[PDB]
Amino acid sequence: IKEGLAASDDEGQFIDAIAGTCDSDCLKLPLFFAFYFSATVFSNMCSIPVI
Amino acid sequence: PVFEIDVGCDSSKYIMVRGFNKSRCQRRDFSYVIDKELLDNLKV
């Protein structure tokens, strides 16, 4: 790893890199999910009148 | 009786905050950036 190790956090030891992808600005997901809700809702309006 | 009196500090007397010790608590290296709150981008 690089020099790094800015803050971290641990109790019994230290220098513990947390696993998984970290996200600081991931908060567009509720807006994207609401717009996908609307897209799926209006996509499901289409097949019933066709049938 | 021959003796000596010296006026000055012994360079062995100082002030410690209560409950604080030098190396009782073990830790590792730290690094941080401070900006927008000083009197532009400090890395210490």
Please provide the DSSP assignment of B6-38 as one string: --S--S------TT--SSSS-------EE-SS-
- CB–CB of B31 and A15 under 8 A? no
Whether B29 and B37 have beta carbons less than 8 Å apart is answered as no
Q: Give the whole-angstrom CA distance, residue A22 versus residue B21.
A: 35
| CB contact (8 A) between residue A7 and residue B27 | no
Interface test with B, best of A1, A2, A5 (most B CBs within 10 A): A5
Dist CA B20 CA B16 (whole Å)? 7
What's the alpha-carbon Rg for chain B, to the nearest Å?
21
d(CA A17, CA A9): 9
Q: How was this structure determined?
A: cryo-EM
User: What is the C-alpha to C-alpha distance for residues A3 and B1, in angstroms, rounded to an integer?
Assistant: 64
- Which chain B positions have a beta carbon within 8 Å of A14's beta carbon? 27-28
Task: Give B-chain residues touching A4 at CB under 8 angstroms.
Answer: 31
